[PDB]
Short mmCIF file of C-alpha atoms and ligand atoms in Angstrom, two decimals:
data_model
loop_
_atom_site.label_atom_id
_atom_site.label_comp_id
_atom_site.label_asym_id
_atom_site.label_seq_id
_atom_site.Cartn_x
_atom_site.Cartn_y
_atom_site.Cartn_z
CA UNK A 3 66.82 -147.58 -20.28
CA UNK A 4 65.35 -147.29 -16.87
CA UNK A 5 68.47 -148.87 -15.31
CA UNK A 6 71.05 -146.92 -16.70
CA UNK A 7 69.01 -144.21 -15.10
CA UNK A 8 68.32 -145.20 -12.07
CA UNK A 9 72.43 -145.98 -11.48
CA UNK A 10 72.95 -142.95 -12.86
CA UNK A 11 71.23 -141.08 -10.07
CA UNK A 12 71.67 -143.21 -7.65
CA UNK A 13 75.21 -142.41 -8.27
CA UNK A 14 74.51 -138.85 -7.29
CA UNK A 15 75.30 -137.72 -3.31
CA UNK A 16 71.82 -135.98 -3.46
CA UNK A 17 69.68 -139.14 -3.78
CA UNK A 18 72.26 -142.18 -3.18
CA UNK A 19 70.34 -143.41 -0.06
CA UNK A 20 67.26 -143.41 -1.90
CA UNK A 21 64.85 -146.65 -2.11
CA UNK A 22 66.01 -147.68 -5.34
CA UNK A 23 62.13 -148.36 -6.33
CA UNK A 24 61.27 -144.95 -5.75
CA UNK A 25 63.45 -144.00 -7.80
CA UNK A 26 62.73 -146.74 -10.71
CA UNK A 27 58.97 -146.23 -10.17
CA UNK A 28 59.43 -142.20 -10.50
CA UNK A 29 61.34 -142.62 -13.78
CA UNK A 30 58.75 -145.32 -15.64
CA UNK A 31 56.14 -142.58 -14.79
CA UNK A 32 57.73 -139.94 -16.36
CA UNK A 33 58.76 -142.01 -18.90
CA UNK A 34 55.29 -142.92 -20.49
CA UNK A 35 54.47 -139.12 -19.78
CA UNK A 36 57.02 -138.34 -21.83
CA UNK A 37 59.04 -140.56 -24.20
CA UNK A 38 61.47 -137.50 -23.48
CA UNK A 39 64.49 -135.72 -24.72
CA UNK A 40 65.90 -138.35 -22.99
CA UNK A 41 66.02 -136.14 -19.83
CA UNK A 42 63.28 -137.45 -18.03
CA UNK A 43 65.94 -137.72 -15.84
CA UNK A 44 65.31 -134.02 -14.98
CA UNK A 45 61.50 -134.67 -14.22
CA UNK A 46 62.23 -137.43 -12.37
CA UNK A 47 65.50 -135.79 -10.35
CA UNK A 48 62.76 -132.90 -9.56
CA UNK A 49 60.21 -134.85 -8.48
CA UNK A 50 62.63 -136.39 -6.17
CA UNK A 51 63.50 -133.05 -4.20
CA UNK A 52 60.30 -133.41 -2.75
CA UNK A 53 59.52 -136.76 -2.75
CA UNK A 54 61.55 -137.36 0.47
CA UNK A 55 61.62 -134.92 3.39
CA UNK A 56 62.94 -131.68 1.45
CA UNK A 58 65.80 -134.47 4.96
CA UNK A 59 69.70 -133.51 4.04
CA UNK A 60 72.54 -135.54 5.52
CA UNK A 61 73.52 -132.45 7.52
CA UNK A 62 70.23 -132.96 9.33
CA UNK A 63 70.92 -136.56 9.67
CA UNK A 64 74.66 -136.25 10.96
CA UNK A 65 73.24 -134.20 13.28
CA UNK A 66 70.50 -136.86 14.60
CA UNK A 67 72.93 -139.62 14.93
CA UNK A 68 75.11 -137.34 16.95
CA UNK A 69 72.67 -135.77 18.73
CA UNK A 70 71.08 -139.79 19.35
CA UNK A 71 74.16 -141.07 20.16
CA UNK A 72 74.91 -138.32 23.19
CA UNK A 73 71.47 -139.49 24.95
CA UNK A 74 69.49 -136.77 23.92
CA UNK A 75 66.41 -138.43 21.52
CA UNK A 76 64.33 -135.46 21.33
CA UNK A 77 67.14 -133.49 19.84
CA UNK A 78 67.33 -136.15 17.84
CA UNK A 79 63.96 -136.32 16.58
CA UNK A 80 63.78 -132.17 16.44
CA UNK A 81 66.16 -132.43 13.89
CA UNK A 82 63.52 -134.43 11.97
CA UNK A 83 60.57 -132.11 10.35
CA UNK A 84 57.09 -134.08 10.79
CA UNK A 85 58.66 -135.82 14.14
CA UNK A 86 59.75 -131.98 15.34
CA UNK A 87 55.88 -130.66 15.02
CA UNK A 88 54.35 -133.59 16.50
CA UNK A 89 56.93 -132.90 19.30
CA UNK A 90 55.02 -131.02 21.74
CA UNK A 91 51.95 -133.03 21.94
CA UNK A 92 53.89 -136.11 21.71
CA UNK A 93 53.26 -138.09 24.68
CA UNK A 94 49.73 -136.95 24.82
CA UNK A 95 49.37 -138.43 20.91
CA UNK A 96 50.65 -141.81 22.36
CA UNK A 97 48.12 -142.00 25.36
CA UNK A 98 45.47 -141.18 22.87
CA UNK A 99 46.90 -144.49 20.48
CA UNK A 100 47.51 -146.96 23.41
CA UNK A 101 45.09 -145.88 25.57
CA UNK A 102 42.82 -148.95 25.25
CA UNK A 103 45.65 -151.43 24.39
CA UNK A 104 49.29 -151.13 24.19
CA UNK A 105 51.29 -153.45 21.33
CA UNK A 106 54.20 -155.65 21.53
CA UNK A 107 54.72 -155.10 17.95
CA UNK A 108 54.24 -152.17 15.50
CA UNK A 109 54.72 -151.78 12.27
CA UNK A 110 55.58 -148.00 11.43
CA UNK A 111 55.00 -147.39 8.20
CA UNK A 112 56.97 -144.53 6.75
CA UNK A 113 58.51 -144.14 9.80
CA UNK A 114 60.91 -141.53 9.41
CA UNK A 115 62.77 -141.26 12.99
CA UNK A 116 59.68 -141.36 14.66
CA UNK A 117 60.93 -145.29 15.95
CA UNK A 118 62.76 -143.16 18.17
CA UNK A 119 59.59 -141.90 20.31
CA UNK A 120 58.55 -145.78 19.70
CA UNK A 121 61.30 -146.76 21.93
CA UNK A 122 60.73 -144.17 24.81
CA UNK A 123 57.68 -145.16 25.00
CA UNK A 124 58.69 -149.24 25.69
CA UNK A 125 57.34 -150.58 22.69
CA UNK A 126 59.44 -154.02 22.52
CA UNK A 127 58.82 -154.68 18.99
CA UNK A 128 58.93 -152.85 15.91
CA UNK A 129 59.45 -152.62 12.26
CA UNK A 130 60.05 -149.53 10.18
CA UNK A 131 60.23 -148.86 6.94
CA UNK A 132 60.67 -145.85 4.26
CA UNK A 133 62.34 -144.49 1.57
CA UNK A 134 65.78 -142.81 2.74
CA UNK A 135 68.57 -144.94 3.97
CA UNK A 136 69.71 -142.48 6.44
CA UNK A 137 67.05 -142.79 8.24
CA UNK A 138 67.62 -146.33 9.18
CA UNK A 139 71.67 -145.21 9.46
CA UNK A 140 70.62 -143.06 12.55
CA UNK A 141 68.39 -145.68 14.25
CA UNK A 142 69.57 -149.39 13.61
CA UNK A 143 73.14 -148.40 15.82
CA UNK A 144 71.11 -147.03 17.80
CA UNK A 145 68.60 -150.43 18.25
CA UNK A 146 71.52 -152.80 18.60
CA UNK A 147 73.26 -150.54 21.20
CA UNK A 148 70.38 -150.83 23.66
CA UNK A 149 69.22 -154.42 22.24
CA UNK A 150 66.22 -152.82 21.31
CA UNK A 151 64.62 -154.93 18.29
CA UNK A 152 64.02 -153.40 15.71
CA UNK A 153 64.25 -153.48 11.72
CA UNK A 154 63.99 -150.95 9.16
CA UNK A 155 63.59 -152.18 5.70
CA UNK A 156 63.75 -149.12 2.72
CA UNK A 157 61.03 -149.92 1.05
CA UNK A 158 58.76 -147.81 -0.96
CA UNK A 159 55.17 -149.20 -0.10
CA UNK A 160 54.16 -148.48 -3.51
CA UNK A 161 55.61 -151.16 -5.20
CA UNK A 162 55.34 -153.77 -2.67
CA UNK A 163 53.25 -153.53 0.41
CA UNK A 164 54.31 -154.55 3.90
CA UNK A 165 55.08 -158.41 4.39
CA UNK A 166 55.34 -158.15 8.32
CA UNK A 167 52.63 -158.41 11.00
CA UNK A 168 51.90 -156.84 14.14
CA UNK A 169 49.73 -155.66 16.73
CA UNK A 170 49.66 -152.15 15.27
CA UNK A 171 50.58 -150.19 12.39
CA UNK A 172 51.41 -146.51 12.36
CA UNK A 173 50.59 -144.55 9.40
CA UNK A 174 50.82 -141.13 10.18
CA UNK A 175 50.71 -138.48 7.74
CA UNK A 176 51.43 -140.23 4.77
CA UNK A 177 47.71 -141.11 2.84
CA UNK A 178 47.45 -137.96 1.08
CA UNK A 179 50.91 -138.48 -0.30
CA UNK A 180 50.16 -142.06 -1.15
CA UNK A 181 46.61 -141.28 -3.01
CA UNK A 182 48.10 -138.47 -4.79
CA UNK A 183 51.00 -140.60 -6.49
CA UNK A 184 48.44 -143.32 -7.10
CA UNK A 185 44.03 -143.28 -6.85
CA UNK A 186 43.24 -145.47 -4.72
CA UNK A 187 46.32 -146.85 -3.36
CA UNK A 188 45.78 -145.05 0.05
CA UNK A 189 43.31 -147.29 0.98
CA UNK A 190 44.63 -150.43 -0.45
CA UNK A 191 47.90 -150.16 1.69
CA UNK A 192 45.38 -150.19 4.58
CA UNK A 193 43.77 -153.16 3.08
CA UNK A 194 47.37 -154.99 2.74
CA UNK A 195 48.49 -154.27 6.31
CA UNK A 196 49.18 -157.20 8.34
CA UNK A 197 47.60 -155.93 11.51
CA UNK A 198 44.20 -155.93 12.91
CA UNK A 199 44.96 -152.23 14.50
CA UNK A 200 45.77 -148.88 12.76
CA UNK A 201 46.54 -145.26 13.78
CA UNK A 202 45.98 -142.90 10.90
CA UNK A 203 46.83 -139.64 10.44
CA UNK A 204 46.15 -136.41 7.93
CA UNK A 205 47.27 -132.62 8.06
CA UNK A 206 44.93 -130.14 9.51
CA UNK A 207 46.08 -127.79 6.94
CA UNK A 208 46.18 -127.78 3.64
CA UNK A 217 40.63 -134.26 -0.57
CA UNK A 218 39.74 -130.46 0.97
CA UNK A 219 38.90 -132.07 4.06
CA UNK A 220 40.28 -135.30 4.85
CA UNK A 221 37.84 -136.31 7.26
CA UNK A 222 34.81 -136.35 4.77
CA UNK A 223 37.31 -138.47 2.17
CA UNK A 224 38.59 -140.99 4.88
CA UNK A 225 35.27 -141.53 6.84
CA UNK A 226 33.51 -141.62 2.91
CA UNK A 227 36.39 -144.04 1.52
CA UNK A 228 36.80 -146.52 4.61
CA UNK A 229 36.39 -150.30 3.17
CA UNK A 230 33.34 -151.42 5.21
CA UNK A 231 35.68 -154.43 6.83
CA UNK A 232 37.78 -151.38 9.05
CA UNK A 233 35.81 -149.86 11.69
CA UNK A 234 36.27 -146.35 13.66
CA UNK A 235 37.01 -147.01 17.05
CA UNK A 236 38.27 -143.35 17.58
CA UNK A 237 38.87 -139.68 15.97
CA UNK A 238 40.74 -136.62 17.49
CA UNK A 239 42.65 -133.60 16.55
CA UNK A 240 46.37 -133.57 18.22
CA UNK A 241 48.82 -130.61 17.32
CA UNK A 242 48.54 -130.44 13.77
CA UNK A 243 46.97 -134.03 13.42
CA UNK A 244 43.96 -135.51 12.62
CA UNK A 245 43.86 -138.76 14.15
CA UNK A 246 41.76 -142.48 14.02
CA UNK A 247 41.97 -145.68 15.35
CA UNK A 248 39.93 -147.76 13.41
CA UNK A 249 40.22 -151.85 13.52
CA UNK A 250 40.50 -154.42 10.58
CA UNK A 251 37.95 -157.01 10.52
N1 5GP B 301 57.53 -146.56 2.70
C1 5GP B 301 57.22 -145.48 1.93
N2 5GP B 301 57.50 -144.22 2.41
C2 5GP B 301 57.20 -143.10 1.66
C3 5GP B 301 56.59 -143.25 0.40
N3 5GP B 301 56.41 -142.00 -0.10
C4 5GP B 301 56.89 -141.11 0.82
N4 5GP B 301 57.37 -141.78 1.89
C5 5GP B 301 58.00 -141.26 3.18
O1 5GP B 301 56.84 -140.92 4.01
C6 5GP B 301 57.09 -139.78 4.88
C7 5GP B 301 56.05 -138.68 4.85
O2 5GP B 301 55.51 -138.79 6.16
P1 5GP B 301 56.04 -137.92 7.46
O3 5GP B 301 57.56 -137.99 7.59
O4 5GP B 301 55.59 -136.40 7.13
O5 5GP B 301 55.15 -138.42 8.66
C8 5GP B 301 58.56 -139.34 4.54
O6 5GP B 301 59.40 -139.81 5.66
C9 5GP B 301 58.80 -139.96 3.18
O7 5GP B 301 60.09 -140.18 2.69
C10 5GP B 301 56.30 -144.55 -0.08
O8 5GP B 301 55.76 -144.69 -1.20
N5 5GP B 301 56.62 -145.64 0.70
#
């Protein structure tokens, strides 16, 4: 069964800090696709590689270490969609708060970006994704500055956010989302607890994203904003 499975790899060093529903949701998929050799374990342990990062504990060590010595943007270099948004970092963030800065955001498949959150005096945030160590590197990290905030690994695919705030942050992450699952891009937008968003898609390669976001936006969110940062598309838009 599906259980035996996921302990199985969950039991391996490669995927052990995975979300467990990931992992669960992953194998019932290839499952019904299959009704396998039994080793749909293989599909599944496959489609994992990829699923997360493609993020190894030697990078994390090395961002806990790195965090720990005062250096952040080390730490968040050693992170692969935080290290590209690196340069234009603090000029993405003016563009976000520029008309109002929150108390509390809810960054949704955070990664280490919390990090940049907290340099940038946020006092409130919540976190959440699919990889343990990510939370590893930045909840010592939150208590030793009395910094609050809470990462929770969830996979937003099997249960949307239950936490509200003045913001959420989904950067980079719809295309993944709508590709595992039509139309659940928009319906995690739809579930967010938060009257403010800050989207984001690739500017390389839904061909172009703009024409499928702007076409697909429920007619209760709004576009306060567009604009092209680094290798990011982004918009503000406002839940009604
Ligand atoms: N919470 C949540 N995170 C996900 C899901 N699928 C992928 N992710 C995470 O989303 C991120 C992709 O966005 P990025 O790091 O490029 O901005 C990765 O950190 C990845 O592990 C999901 O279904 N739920």
């Amino acid at each position: 069964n599906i259980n035996d499975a996921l302990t199985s790899i969950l039991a391996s060093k490669k995927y052990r800090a995975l979300c467990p529903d990931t992992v669960r949701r992953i194998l019932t998929e290839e499952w019904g696709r299959h009704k396998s050799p039994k080793q749909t374990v293989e599909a599944a342990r496959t489609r994992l590689h990829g699923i997360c990062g493609a993020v190894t504990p030697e990078s994390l060590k090395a961002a806990a270490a790195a965090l720990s010595a005062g250096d952040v943007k080390k730490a968040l270099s050693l992170h692969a969609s935080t290290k590209e948004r690196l340069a234009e970092l603090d000029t993405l963030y003016d563009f976000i708060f520029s008309a109002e800065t929150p108390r509390r955001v809810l960054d949704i498949a955070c990664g280490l970006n919390p990090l940049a959150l907290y340099e940038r005096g946020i006092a409130s945030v919540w976190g959440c994704d699919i990889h343990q160590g990510l939370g590893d590197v930045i909840t010592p990290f939150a208590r030793e500055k009395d910094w609050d905030f809470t990462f929770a690994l969830q996979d937003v695919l099997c249960a949307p956010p239950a936490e509200a705030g003045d913001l959420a942050l989904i950067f980079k992450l719809l295309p993944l989302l709508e590709r595992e699952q039509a139309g659940s891009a928009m319906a995690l937008l739809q579930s967010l607890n938060t009257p403010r968003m800050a989207v984001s898609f690739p500017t390389r390669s839904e061909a172009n994203y703009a024409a499928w976001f702007e076409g697909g936006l429920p007619a209760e969110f709004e576009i306060e904003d567009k604009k092209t940062i680094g290798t990011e598309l982004i918009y503000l838009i406002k839940k009604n």
